[PDB]
Design a protein around this ligand. Structure first.
Ligand SMILES: Nc1ncnc2c1ncn2[C@@H]1O[C@H](COP(=O)(O)OP(=O)(O)O)[C@@H](N)[C@H]1O
Ligand SMILES: Nc1ncnc2c1ncn2[C@@H]1O[C@H](COP(=O)(O)OP(=O)(O)O)[C@@H](N)[C@H]1O
Ligand SMILES: Nc1ncnc2c1ncn2[C@@H]1O[C@H](COP(=O)(O)OP(=O)(O)O)[C@@H](N)[C@H]1O
Ligand SMILES: Nc1ncnc2c1ncn2[C@@H]1O[C@H](COP(=O)(O)OP(=O)(O)O)[C@@H](N)[C@H]1O
Ligand SMILES: Nc1ncnc2c1ncn2[C@@H]1O[C@H](COP(=O)(O)OP(=O)(O)O)[C@@H](N)[C@H]1O
Ligand SMILES: Nc1ncnc2c1ncn2[C@@H]1O[C@H](COP(=O)(O)OP(=O)(O)O)[C@@H](N)[C@H]1O
Lengths: 150, 150, 150, 150, 150, 150
């Protein structure tokens, strides 16, 4: 189904660095639709839940602190395989090991400031969407360029 | 004093031609700070309230009928003379008459499908901002690049 | 009418300099359709007729010589106001006086190597199309993105 | 010896998504010389003759039915291992699986609408070139950038 | 002559914003040749000599303090009419007044930190070029592209 | 440490093709800081010392002759893991083998003229950096962007 959605959030570093458009631009070009988008400064409460699975790791502290140290451009893209393609496009956890051509590969250098977050799977995509987005903020009627899909 | 704001909004034809990234990136490279942002489908009420000044104009008709036929990305940016600088970057009403390097100049071709809206005067920015944006959807502690202003 | 066509030809200098895609790219983005396109090395006979109105000027010699000293990517774009918009996008005769953002302004430096040629009016557009293009080489069925025109 | 050629062709979905410039520019920046080029609407004959190797495959069906539903930009480039290098730049069959930086990787999302075709082996280039191109539509006196080869 | 030269300098606010490459590439694109290039930190001496003409002018204070406040990438480009062309590409004194397409229009918003200085006349160029560069650093051998000048 | 340094050099074939700005901007984009920069023409001495390791290696002949055959833009970038990251961005020895996204994959097609050299290890970097640069040319003051490193 071409309804697969994912959740992306350009953190306070891709934001203060002037990358919001560049990043969105890359997904628009691939062929994915933007079904939600907004700017907000994440709450500790939202930071801790967003980052639930890292509750016990040394860096969870360093994480939530930063992800709410400024604005975050949260968004949702839809399309076939969107969840895995986005990751692929994002790169790997460490910017320095990210191949050139991927968001992290091209602009990233330090794991702590690795620019963007993208759902690792449909399940977390959905936990992430619902969580940041109230169903009203999303689109419903969606048909990207009929030259994308057969 | 470096806090001037304008409300821009990419219309259904910009948002659907996959130009939200490009457009945002342009003001972003210029140096203005994004202070609000959100996708949505405008309502006849807010749209007709937007085009108040064009009520009896023969085009107000299909004007309101287009900024509600799909998604709109609203936004507010901030910095020195952003209001005047934005329009300049947008171009002129007729995209065919806009200079290359401007937004309508580079991607527009018809007056109905002229891609983006801008605030023509502070008074008007402040007026369209409050329309589209609630007071708690816009940043406050701002800090543009420290290399940007003297 | 959205059938206005124009004739553009990237001369042997925009060609050997690696500009064909860049140049085409700019017209595709503005919103114009490509109704014909081909590579060929112009004939003296075609050069002299193409450049008919400069038959008596000192440079006509220097012109036709060069315009057939190599391959030329001849093309035809269609859309509203295509003839005048293209010129505007091309710049002025002298690259050095061409505003930045226009093809000549950005890549041009010497009038003799000013990169591209674009019809100055419908009348020469048509004399130029017919002349380089046999009606069979052009398209007929044409509808660009319905987000360009109202 | 530096004369290898491949026949690439931007399909109805690339040509219609306004990607002929971008695609051409990529091989152009790489260093290959364009040695032929032409837009056109392929015929069932030449198309089915193109996809000969896929005759009984369940997709040959709507395969031939798409490369004839609109315009196609055929082209031939030339240089060292262009044949192998082209494919690499194109990506892999599934656009979702193509790496960012490649053509299908950056703009594709479905296998039916995968944008561009390429020659997978010299023997196959030479085979598709002669199909689409008459012997008098391709350059002969070629001279790539003098800084390009040793 | 195709051997005119201008002295350009990406100011500290330019070097700090990651603009060196972009700025340099705009020029390499137009067709000018890099004859001189180097990063240094201007000594108060050089800044006073270089910005001499504005001594009695009030703002001399900032121009020099600011300009010595960090690294500078000094450049000397050669080319037919480079002096007047380069300043055109730069835009006007106020980045808010500069039009899109020019270095200051695309990137700057405040007069105090307007990214780049460029020689205003062939008078100031040779003056500034000698004051910031030494005969041995500047190339004597220039091979102007044949597809550039006639 | 965020103070590792690599020595990069755009070879003659790179300077001649108008690639300095692009190459430099790829690095400024990633997040590395330019610490050293200058254009010179390598003396046969420097080229032999610099390319020493390949003496017994056959192709020593070309590497040095070619590398002295024109201007060079010498660079020294600083950054966490710059050495290994920079070589990754460059691609592999053969530009035909390099993947899109890297300097050599996007731009080169022949091993002999592969545009840029980059230090292979922190061992070779400090060696090469001292041999091509002088303590006074290299910045001592570095202010690494806060949105870059944690
Ligand atoms: N080694 C670590 N040191 C510091 N921060 C880390 C480390 N590992 C992960 N993080 C950070 O928090 C996130 C960890 O999530 P995960 O490891 O799943 O990566 P990804 O973001 O690719 O899903 C990273 N994105 C990064 O900001
Ligand atoms: N003659 C016209 N026909 C159709 N649409 C028009 C016409 N004049 C203006 N409009 C449309 O309505 C909007 C009118 O606002 P205004 O004329 O102030 O433009 P701007 O966006 O430059 O402020 C335009 N953006 C355009 O889409
Ligand atoms: N002053 C001149 N010296 C040399 N070549 C010239 C001169 N004037 C015009 N040409 C050349 O031939 C063409 C002249 O046509 P025209 O003057 O109408 O310019 P355009 O190409 O803008 O229509 C130019 N494009 C340029 O290559
Ligand atoms: N499973 C499939 N379903 C739909 N279309 C397919 C499938 N396999 C291949 N095709 C289509 O037919 C072409 C088949 O050729 P091939 O598989 O050799 O691809 P490539 O373009 O990588 O050589 C593709 N480009 C694609 O559009
Ligand atoms: N009104 C001003 N306030 C502050 N600094 C200024 C002012 N006007 C000029 N400057 C600075 O002085 C610089 C050099 O001189 P000038 O203004 O004559 O030429 P240009 O502006 O083209 O460089 C400018 N580039 C700008 O950085
Ligand atoms: N097979 C070869 N034929 C010609 N020149 C070569 C060959 N292999 C290497 N070179 C040149 O020698 C250079 C420097 O050394 P090396 O190949 O060890 O590292 P790198 O290739 O990463 O620079 C290469 N960059 C390339 O320009």
């Amino acid at each position: 189904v071409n309804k697969e959605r994912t959740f992306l959030a350009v953190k306070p570093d891709g934001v203060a660095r002037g990358l919001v458009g560049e990043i969105i631009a890359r997904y628009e070009k691939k062929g994915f639709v933007l079904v939600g988008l907004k700017q907000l400064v994440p709450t500790k409460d939202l930071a801790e839940s967003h980052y639930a699975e890292h509750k016990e790791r040394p860096f969870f502290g360093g994480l939530v602190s930063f992800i709410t140290s400024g604005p975050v451009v949260a968004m949702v893209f839809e399309g076939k395989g969107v969840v895995a393609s986005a990751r692929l496009m994002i790169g790997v956890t460490n910017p320095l090991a990210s191949a050139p051509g991927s968001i992290r590969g091209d602009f990233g250098v330090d794991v702590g400031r690795n620019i963007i977050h993208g759902s690792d799977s449909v399940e977390s995509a959905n936990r992430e969407i619902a969580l940041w987005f109230k169903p009203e903020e999303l689109l419903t009627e969606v048909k990207p360029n009929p030259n994308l899909y057969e």
